[PDB]
Amino acid sequence: KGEELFTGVVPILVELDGDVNGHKFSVSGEGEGDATYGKLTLKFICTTGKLPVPWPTLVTTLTYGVQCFSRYPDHMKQHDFFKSAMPEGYVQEMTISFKDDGNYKTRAEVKFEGDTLVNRIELKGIDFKEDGNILGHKLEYNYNSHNVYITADKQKNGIKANFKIRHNIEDGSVQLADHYQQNTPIGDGPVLLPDNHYLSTQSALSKDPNEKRDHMVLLEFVTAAGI
Ligand SMILES: [Mg+2]
Numbered sequence: 001k002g003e004e005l006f007t008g009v010v011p012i013l014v015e016l017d018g019d020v021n022g023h024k025f026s027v028s029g030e031g032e033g034d035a036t037y038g039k040l041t042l043k044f045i046c047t048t049g050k051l052p053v054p055w056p057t058l059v060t061t062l063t064y065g066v067q068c069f070s071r072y073p074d075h076m077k078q079h080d081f082f083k084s085a086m087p088e089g090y091v092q093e094m095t096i097s098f099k100d101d102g103n104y105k106t107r108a109e110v111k112f113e114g115d116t117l118v119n120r121i122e123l124k125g126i127d128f129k130e131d132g133n134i135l136g137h138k139l140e141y142n143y144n145s146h147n148v149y150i151t152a153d154k155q156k157n158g159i160k161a162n163f164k165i166r167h168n169i170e171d172g173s174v175q176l177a178d179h180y181q182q183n184t185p186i187g188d189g190p191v192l193l194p195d196n197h198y199l200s201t202q203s204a205l206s207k208d209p210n211e212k213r214d215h216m217v218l219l220e221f222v223t224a225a226g227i
Contacts, residue, residue, distance in 0.1 A: 009033070014042070034219045085185040091108070099176040162220055201222045
């Protein structure tokens with residue numbers, strides 16, 4: 001049972017390579033997860049310089065590979081695909097469609113490296129508008145709460161998820177980002193295929209006052225429900 005790897009605090013490393021409309025960038029993340037409380041504390045740094053898209057547009061890319069840190073109440077533990085795939089892990093893919101603008105396509109490999117949970121990601125963004133809300137940096141530095149709806153994909157011995165993120169524009173409007181996600185196990189062992197349910201996520205974005213590099217400090221809670 002992979003769930004046994006998550007009874008305490010687990011260190012996390014996130015590494016992302018991106019290209020959006022030919023702007024290339026990399027982000028490195030460090031922090032920890034405590035699934036007992038559905039709690040993620042992470043600090044992300046753009047190692048190539050300035051991030052060419054707003055930080056909030058990368059939150060699902062940078063964290064949805066660590067949905068293994070969701071708190072599954074005991075009565076629903078037989079629905080926790082994510083932990084059950086550990087330690088060998090899973091491949092997560094996402095298509096993120098920004099209404100009236102471009103899209104992101106991501107691939108991540110999520111697994112243990114020793115006692116550390118690692119998220120290795122590639123992002124490709126295309127057909128963004130030069131001064132739309134994303135390349136024009138018109139998004140506020142904040143993050144609304146929302147749910148991730150999960151369904152089983154028995155075919156792939158995995159799960160799918162669908163959800164809408166509403167990013168706050170600086171003028172009071174909303175920039176919608178439709179998400180379609182699929183996860184497939186990397187290993188051979190059996191995994192838990194869940195009944196339909198969702199993850200309730202809440203996120204606070206902040207800055208480290210002594211950090212001069214372009215960065216994002218993130219506190220996130222993720223809790224399974226719907227059953
Ligand atoms: Mg049943």
